[PDB]
Write a protein that binds this DNA or RNA. Structure first.
Ligand code: CA
Ligand code: CA
Lengths: 138, 148, 133, 148
DNA sequence: GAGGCCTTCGGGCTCATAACCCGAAGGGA
DNA sequence: TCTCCCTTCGGGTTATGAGCCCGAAGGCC
């Protein structure tokens, strides 16, 4: 009906939609031998982006995402998708790899200390900024 | 942004809808064919034309057109869609994440512009209204071809 | 990863379809039972694309496969730039590893050989599909 | 007979296979709204290519391409050339000879309108395009140049 | 049976994409 | 004395794809 191969498919399409809303271009590679799923044309500058989907986990009120480079590396941005809340976390390369195993995402209605990841919730400006910065180093 | 970007957004929106309803999605290669998408509905394939609507300034409602245009130096000529050009036409309103789905005939049967009203209106509403989220019509056409 | 070999087979197929003026459609993700679908003069035909590897002993090429859906399958040989196009029924009517002989070794060439570049079979099933209305 | 975009999509498809057979990555875009047709991943660096399919110029016996995006369906002809930053390499194609010319942007835009490919025997001079026959190394250079 | 609010239609647009035609320019040889 | 060869360069052309504007008709109620 709708397995893991399909959950990742929606996540990919969601990211494409967001990029299109941002007015950006979007390039798709041939086959899955490359290290990144998508690339966004942010006003001329091409940025590699890996798409990731999250799972609801445990009890628990909060979502989880994983990074498996054992079964590639080097993109620019990782985008995590939460199907239920139709929202994206956007992580830069270094921040994404700097996590050990799992990355905890916590939505909920606040009133506690949030994880490191929380500052990257819907943080599409970070990729918007990398494009502008990389234009000037050229 | 410039025209084609808007279309691509609507087209993308359509794609997501089909995926959420567990249908397969096929993208054609290059803006050359008379349809934007086709959906693998439980085995059979149905071509889909996607159009993005615009809110009219005066009337206060969203409208699409069913004609294709060419305007060269001397004169301008139009090419409407034939019946076999696709199987369904989906109109997208962007600000309200909203789809009307029309069969080909119901779509070509219009003269040119085809208005969609979302206001309370109190009028009896035009024949378009009967197609708000008509995703069942594409599902039904699916089982209609399913047997022998 | 031999995923590249498959990639090359597919892009060759795509090119062949365009070389005969058809439309080509490409499914998002790999959930479906077909790799490609051609728009032949209006009619949509699914197609599986599989690549072949050269036999160790004999000078031959072999391709492995693992009614409804499919309706066509195209087999690629890189070095000798040609396709074997099998209708689904003929295709499943094989044990496991279907063999292809391309050498001119005089001997009675197998059942497979009849499907050399038979792109007319696609065109036929396409024209015949218009008779059902 | 079905024309124009089909021919362009074939030339594009030829470039797809060339790139792949040189072990490069190939990226295909959204739809026909960007100033480039393909993007090659060359040793990790992404470069933009603009594909154009040539035609046999019957009078001159050459294969030719226009370097200016001439935009019609407007009742007024406007000729907008390409910018230096619209892409990295323009690849002219000769189907029938399965031939590719690769031009860098700066040399591609530097032409006024038409660029000719001689490809015939016994001529007085060679065209300024001559040293660009199958010049895929030029896109290896820029890329090695990009890294560091 | 009146003055609207309200749809249809069929003219007129603009942006992008792709490939082609040809009469002179006017430097190489 | 190259003076014809033949590349080049601004005018012309076609097809496809997107989404739009607006006003004379005329219906709903
Ligand atoms: Ca469309
Ligand atoms: Ca092009």
């Amino acid at each position: 009906m709708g397995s893991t191969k399909l959950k990742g498919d929606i996540a990919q399409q969601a990211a494409i939609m967001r990029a299109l809303k941002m007015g950006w271009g979007v390039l798709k590679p041939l086959g899955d031998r490359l290290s990144y799923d998508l690339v966004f044309d942010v006003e001329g500058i091409l940025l590699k982006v890996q798409v990731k989907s999250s799972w609801k986990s445990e009890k628990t009120g909060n979502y989880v995402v994983d990074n498996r480079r054992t079964r590639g590396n080097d993109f620019d941005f990782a985008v995590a998708y939460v199907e239920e809340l139709e929202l994206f976390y956007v992580f830069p390369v270094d921040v994404f790899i700097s996590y050990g195993s799992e990355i905890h995402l916590v939505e909920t209605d606040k009133r506690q200390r949030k994880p490191r990841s929380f500052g990257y919730r819907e943080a599409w400006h970070l990729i918007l900024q990398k494009g502008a910065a990389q234009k000037e180093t050229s």
